[PDB]
Amino acid sequence: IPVVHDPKGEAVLPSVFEDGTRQGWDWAGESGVKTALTIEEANGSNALSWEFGYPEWATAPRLDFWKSDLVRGENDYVTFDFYLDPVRATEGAMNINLVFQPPTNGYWVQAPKTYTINFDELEEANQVNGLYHYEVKINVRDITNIQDDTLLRNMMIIFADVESDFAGRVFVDNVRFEG
């Protein structure tokens, strides 16, 4: 049978994953990873979670969130808590990028700046018994091609390899816009 995710639920922000569902989160059709998305505990709260490892954006997990009334408004950032529990992580890095697909902008605008996690610097990261925590914060005020009322349609988060050996489980929680 196909991979089966936990129930999808209804798209809501902030996404907190406390109702047993993915609160509208799913794989993008073009995701390089389509493994099971389940709700798992991280740092005392339920979180969206999956496992994967990079060979060898083709190998990159790409999460997707569709919501009809998604607009930037007066928000300046998208933020989320991100946790990693590696089985292997000793070299390279991971780049996290944010994309929206406004129909008025050819179905693609990207937050200009990349959020980078450097696996050679894990012993400097916030951590509890092999669970590493990053407060991912990506500036969306800096997107000039949209206005505050532009219908964004869907948000994608891309987790791309940078010559890493990462393999393990990851967790996403508290996805929200912030001023």
Add this chain to the structure above:
Amino acid sequence: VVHDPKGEAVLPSVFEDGTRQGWDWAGESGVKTALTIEEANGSNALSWEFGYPEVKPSDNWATAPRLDFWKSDLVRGENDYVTFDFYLDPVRATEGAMNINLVFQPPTNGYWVQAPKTYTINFDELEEANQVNGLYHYEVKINVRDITNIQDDTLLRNMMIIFADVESDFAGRVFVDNVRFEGA
């Protein structure tokens, strides 16, 4: 500050005529130090020196060198990548990384399109990089085929290259050579 002669915009940019072949600092560049032509790896290259500050602005591009290249009839064509040779000769590089991004400003797409994939250099991995006598050589290759908001004939107007700090202590001289579009 005195740069070497700007020259005329030529692509591919090989820097063999004693000029910058049209390359300059973007107005928003965080570094505006002398841009000169210097030898790297047996060829002449566009070069500057700088170091990132220890205090990191929350705007992750405020301290980034930003090169800019204006040319008429700047188009992707059937090419899939922008490539260049990038060299670093650090005096300090013990931690962090550098993110290289590529931006064009087509008037038909809001004066801003960006290659989706960042090219990242990890300073913790210098011992694994190609080097000769302290000069590290990276083959920067950035996919532009994946920009869906341009077409092969879209006038791009200008190209900038942003060299952003990722929690690094880099200080030293860098070199850029052989900037071009190329096919997959």
